[PDB]
Structure formats: structure tokens, C-alpha cells
């Protein structure tokens, strides 16, 4: 029903930490601006309007940061908490939660006011700014697709069914279609629908030695961009994130955590911004993908 | 009798969709301004007047946009749409309408505000800034004349 | 843990009708007094005080009535229906419940406004006043104890 | 969908000027107050409260009466009209119209105020307070109702059918039910279903020197009241006004107008209140009732 504002740490991530800022002791009230601004470059000849390229500015956002604390103590202790968790984080994610949608953006601590103006127990009410890195994206799961045979039917399908030495028979319309392909399950689509811009991936590799990671087609299947890497051993896993703030390319065998960068297949991985199309997974047997696109205005 | 606003997104075009913001669930309401300024050039010599060209210049319209929705989902639905559909396409045309004239004049989306100062089921009353591209100008149908003996 | 205020046409009856006046569509805000004044008769005889019969009066209650309504044809049915339904019955039980309490008041209609001041989808916002017949009441269930050998 | 404000002149009469101040030349805006006050008569014996009789008050309706005149002259002749207009009669019905209800007042004009504060082409911008006579009434027509036989079916029904001579079957719950009555067109019900005040009623009388006029039935088949009339010739219509303000009980006979508070029985005519039951009609042919109905809260 009602909005729901979160504080995160670091998403996408185990140490992960949440303020709930709609009920929880530390609350978010009254954000400044939820909105966009817009700089078009639109000039005018003799009533004639040309127009440019649209530079969609983001505003900083403003809340109306409160405190329900029991104590002076309590109060004092939550406002050192909160403010050092984000600190802590060189950028906090802010969820926009309501009925209809989940956005999330990046931020960072741009103004912060503590006064001694308490109310009742020591209570705050202070107003937080913060720096706009990216307003809104939507972080969902990425999961392939698979192919079904369809189902075979006498005059239909192509088969040499019922009188011997059987029989098939074209007919207008109806004829012979073909019914499904020996060992469909071969066939997976990682379908890439809109353009998106960073993501988080656990890949399990299956051959030592041998290029292991992901690889980006385009619609008439041509590769723009691969993240991959040739390691020694075979890893248990390989822990991919495009975000740019934190860049992570590591591989993981057992409790052991190894920086994968300069493994990496440089002149392969062309761009981080993956195009409509499809993805294809390169020496692995598995793979856990989280897809995070940007929204302008939601 | 009364003045009409359309919001359309493509004009003369077969994906064009309508936004009634005098009738339907997103309103416009108190333009800024729909007039103009110029800049006429004018130097004098010696007391005496000269004047060289008027550049026309037309201000940005700032809207009181209002949503009418049924619940806080409903709102919300309203402002996720009607914005988004003014930036799938780079420019917006907006229809003036009068027992008089019918302009239309194409805006670029300059600013939009959204705020959690809501009153009843959710409703929204934000501010929505749009710079011109060309103000008031006559769509219409063009034929050949036909000559009789 | 938030406050529920309830308005019962009649209770201890099977023909009642409950109207949630903190969730419902017809919503009550704002009450002006809960507490109470009292005329403890206390007289002065040179600066000794003798005391008399304190006699605790019940103020009136005016709460700040809101409808929820999505259309106008709405909002004018939930106020007709709300205010008549009061009518009907010569009192109202009005029902208190928070955390730790669940007290009722038994209340008349002393008086209810109805203006053209109308927001979005034509919702009212108005002043209902009541007159206390008994404030704050325990209606609980008495069952008979039993002995044990 | 919005709201229809008319004021008129003589409503049930004739002679019935209407002003529309919802769209007319002369508005009414903003009504002070439409709801309503009661006075509950509450007495307190130790703590227990103890409820008499509520009075329900109605309170003046004060309109900011606005004038849309073209000229100075248009506008000055608006409120030399619509005040006078006011005047002429002792009272005014006013009309309360919604997508839900129509309902009535009667007015009496309380104050008018005249300014020399014109706005452009000599406008006006005044307040007009009304005294409340009667608050919301429902002003509806009145007609009785007709009952129809019903339809004869096989088995069902009292008939002696199918093989001579004729067999009607006892069954259980099926059995025999009788299909109408012979005639049944003789039977009419003017029926009274909620407690109504006044009534404009255009009486139909058959025979002279017969008293003509309508009784009323309680649930019983009882008379508590009746308007019953003893005339010498036969009036073409007796026209009855139960209003309490301006009563017409009057015998038209072409296009004379005779008075009928005389000739009328004074101990029939017990209260002017019709309760729940039926209405007959004495020694009338035809009838026509318009009946208005009161609602303390629209
Ligand atoms: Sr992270
Ligand atoms: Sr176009
Ligand atoms: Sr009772
Ligand atoms: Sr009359």
C-alpha cells in the first residue's frame, strides 16, 4: 500500500546492512525532489525552433531526517550509527519501494546537520543531502530461457505412420510440419530485451585453462563485448560486477578469493553497456546472473 | 466554450497517443505564460530612434499538473505513464484549443517535480516546466483547387 | 498500536452497522477534547477551603470528518449515508481502542456541516460535533465462577 | 456531474419563473451551511446520561450571489429582477440537484446586500442570507398501482383439465393455486410507503352533492384523516394543497375558481401527516398526486 524507503550499505553484496527509513528508529521524510530536470539546447531562427541533445540532469535529494529514539543516550547513539554506516560506504543505495514498483539509485553523503534543538528524550529532526550517482534502476534476476519439442500429430507432423510402408501427405496448409529437434534441451537463450548497464554474476566454470566467462551477440549474432579468463585451476567460481564504482573480477576456490583482472581477455571486452540480443556462456557449466537497467523518471 | 489541452506525442503521426489535460485523469492547470517577448534592437543617435529586428522570443510554460487517481497505486501509475510517454519521444506537441483558434505549439520537457506532499488517496499536485520549440502554429489539411467551365 | 475509532449504530444489537472511522471511507480526525472538566464547589472561608460535591462535566466532542470518495456521485452518497445512518438510531456508540484500553461513548448528533469547498473527485472536509450522553464505558462479558473440591 | 442550483418562483404552480444560479446570468456560490444542528436535551443523573427529544435546527444558508450582466444597465435590471422576484412571493423553493438526488428548500429571504463595488461592465459581488421554512424535501409524482392475474398453468392451477370430466390434483407444495380473480382490473392501490407532510393533489369528482374527496388508510384498513368535500354541482376538478404556508382547497369548474373551505368536513380532516398505508379515493373518477416527502440530511 503505503511507500517503502530503504538504506543499504553495499547491495549486490554479503556485508550488506539496511536502515529501513520508513519505520525504523532513523526515518527519511519529505525528499526535496523525486523528479528530473532537463537541458534540451533547443535555439530558435526567425520562429523556427531547432533542437539539440537532451541532458538529463539529476537534483539533489533532501530529507527530513528524524530520530525515535527512548534515551538522550539511545538518540545520540543513532544518529553516530547511521551517519558512519554511510560514511563507512563510498556510495549508499536508496530503494523506492511501492504497489506498483522497486527502483533503486546510487548515492552519496552530501550534507549532513546535527543541532542541539531536541525535543522529547533527546529526539532529532535534521535535514540529510545527498549527491545523485544513478537515479533509478531496476535490479532484477537474469535467467535463460528453454525449448520445448512440440507435441507429434498423425497427417500433421513428418512421419511415416499408420499403413505400411507408412505415409505422410501434402496438404494445403496442414501439410507436414517438423515436430521438435532430437535433444532440444541443447537449445538456451540468455535473452538481453532492453539495454542495460551493469550487473552482478556468478559464474561456475567447468575446464581448467581454457577461456571461462560470458560473451555478448548482438541481433544478427555478432559479438560486441566478452568478459573472459584463462586461469590455471578451475575456479568454483567467478564473481563478475560491472557496476564501474566497484569493479569486481574475482575468482573464488573454496575460502580463497583471487583477483581475476589481469587474467582477463582485454581486446575482447570491448564495452560494459550490453546491447539487445543475446548472451552466450563461454567454458561453464552454470551461471547466476542479477541485471541492473536504468529509468530516467519513475 | 471552454479551453481544451491535448498532450500529443506524435502529431501527424500513426503512433500518436492523447493526453487530455483538461478532461482526463492528468491535468494541466495555471500555464505561466503564453504570450512572448522580443528584443527589438533599438539604438538611438542623438535622441532620435532607430529600430533594427525583432527577435521574438518565446518563455518557458510551467504547468500545475495534477493527478486524479483513485488510490495511491492509480497516482503513482499516472505520474510512472505521462511523464515517461513525454520522454520516449524528444519532442511533445501541445494543442491549444478555443471556440476561436486551435495552435498547437511543440514543447521539450525542461522540468517535473515529484514530491510525498500528497492529500487524499494519493494525490499529486507537482509543477511541470517544458521549453518551446516553435509556439503556435496551424496543422492543417492542404488540397488542390479544381477550375469549372 | 494506532488508535481505532468506531462508530456502532446500535451495540448490544443484532441490527448493528459499523463504520471505521480511522481505516473506512468516512474517516474522523482530529478530536477536540477526550478529557474532562470538573466543579469541585470550592469555597474560601478566610484562606481555609472547604470543599463541595465535584460534579465531572463531558465536553462535546467535534471531530474533523473526511470522505474518501473517487468520484463526486461517491463522496455525496458516503455523507447521506453516514449522517442518516446516525439519524436513524437516537444514539451512537463511538468505540476507543488503542493498545491498552477499549472504552465506548454513547453520543447524539449536536451538529454536521456540509460546504462546497470540495478538493479532488469532489471529497468533503468537515466538522461533525457530538453531545455526550456517557463518557468512556466498559462493555465486557460476566460469566458465573465455579468451585473445586 | 456537478451540482444544479434553481431557484423557484411558485413551485407546483403555474406560474413558475425558474433562476438558474448554477448557470444563469445570477449564480449562488459558496453555501455557508447545507448540514444541520440538534439540540438532544440531555440530562445527567450521577454519571448516567439519560436522553430526551432531539430538536433538529436548521440553520441560514448565507450565498455569495454573483451577477453576469454585459453592461451596467444589464446588471443593475439583474438584481431589480431576481430580488423582486423574491419578494413577490411570501417564499422561495430552492433545488438541490446532484448525480444521486434532487432535492428542495424553502426559502425566505433573510438579507441582500447592494454594494457600489463593480467589478467590470458594472458586475456585482454580493451576499444573500436565507431563514429556513423546510429543509431538503423530496418533490415526487404520486400514482397508484395495478394489479395483473396470473398466468394458468397445467397441474399448478385450480382448473379441471386434460381427460373428461376435468382433474385437479392435491399434491404437496405444488398442489393448487389459484391463477387471478375475475375482474381483477377493479382493484387499485394508491400506496403510502414512507411518512409523508404536504401534497398537491388535482381531485377527479364523479357524482354532485356526493362528498368527493380522498381518506387515508393506516396498515389496519382504518381512516385517520380525510379532505372530504360536499359540493352542489360537479366541480371538472377540486384542487388541493396540504402546504401549511399557502393551503388552496378550490372547485374548478371552467374557468371559474371556487372556494371549498366551507363546504369541507372539518371532523374528517384530523392531521395533515399521512402515515404508512393506502390512500382511497371518495367519489372520484380519476386522480393525479404530486407528493413532497421530508430528509433532515441530503
Ligand atoms: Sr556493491
Ligand atoms: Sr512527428
Ligand atoms: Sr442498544
Ligand atoms: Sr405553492
Known amino acids: 500500500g503505503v511507500r517503502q524507503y530503504k538504506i543499504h550499505t ?12 520508513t519505520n ?42 528524524e530520530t525515535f529514539g527512548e534515551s538522550l543516550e539511545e538518540n545520540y547513539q543513532l544518529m553516530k550509527d547511521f551517519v558512519n ?35 522529547k528524550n533527546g529526539t532529532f529532526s535534521e535535514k540529510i543531502t545527498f549527491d545523485i550517482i544513478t537515479k533509478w ?13 512440440g507435441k507429434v500429430i498423425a497427417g500433421m507432423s513428418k512421419i511415416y505412420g499408420g499403413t505400411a510402408p507408412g ?11 517438423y515436430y521438435g ?4 534441451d541443447r537449445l538456451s537463450r540468455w535473452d538481453i530485451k532492453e539495454e542495460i548497464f551493469s550487473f552482478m554474476g556468478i559464474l561456475y566454470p567447468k575446464l581448467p585453462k581454457t577461456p571461462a566467462g560470458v ?4 541481433d544478427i549474432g555478432n559479438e560486441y563485448t566478452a568478459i573472459v579468463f584463462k586461469t590455471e585451476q578451475v575456479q568454483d567460481y567467478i564473481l563478475i560486477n560491472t557496476d564501474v564504482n ?3 573480477y574475482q575468482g573464488w576456490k573454496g575460502t580463497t578469493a583471487l583477483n581475476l583482472f589481469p587474467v582477463m581477455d582485454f581486446e575482447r571486452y570491448r564495452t560494459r553497456i550490453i546491447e539487445k540480443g543475446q548472451m552466450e556462456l563461454i567454458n561453464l557449466s552454470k551461471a547466476e546472473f542479477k541485471i541492473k537497467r536504468k529509468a530516467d523518471f519513475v
Open 10 to 21: 553495499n547491495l549486490d553484496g554479503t556485508d550488506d546492512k539496511v536502515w529501513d527509513v
Open 24 to 65: 525504523g528508529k532513523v526515518r527519511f521524510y519529505q525528499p526535496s525532489n523525486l523528479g528530473l530536470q532537463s537541458t534540451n539546447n533547443i535555439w530558435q531562427s526567425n520562429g523556427i525552433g531547432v533542437m539539440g541533445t537532451r541532458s538529463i540532469t539529476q537534483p539533489q535529494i533532501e530529507f527530513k531526517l
Open 85 to 119: 554506516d554511510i560514511l563507512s560506504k563510498k556510495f549508499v543505495t536508496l530503494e523506492y519501494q511501492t504497489e506498483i514498483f522497486q527502483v533503486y539509485a546510487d548515492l552519496a553523503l552530501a550534507d549532513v546537520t546535527k543541532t542541539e534543538g531536541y525535543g
Open 137 to 149: 534502476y531496476t535490479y532484477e534476476n537474469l535467467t535463460f530461457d528453454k525449448i520445448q519439442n
Open 167 to 177: 505415409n505422410y501427405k501434402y496438404i494445403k496448409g496442414t501439410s507436414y510440419t
Open 181 to 184: 529437434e532430437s535433444d532440444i
Open 215 to 218: 560473451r555478448f551477440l548482438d
Open 246 to 248: 566497484d569493479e569486481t
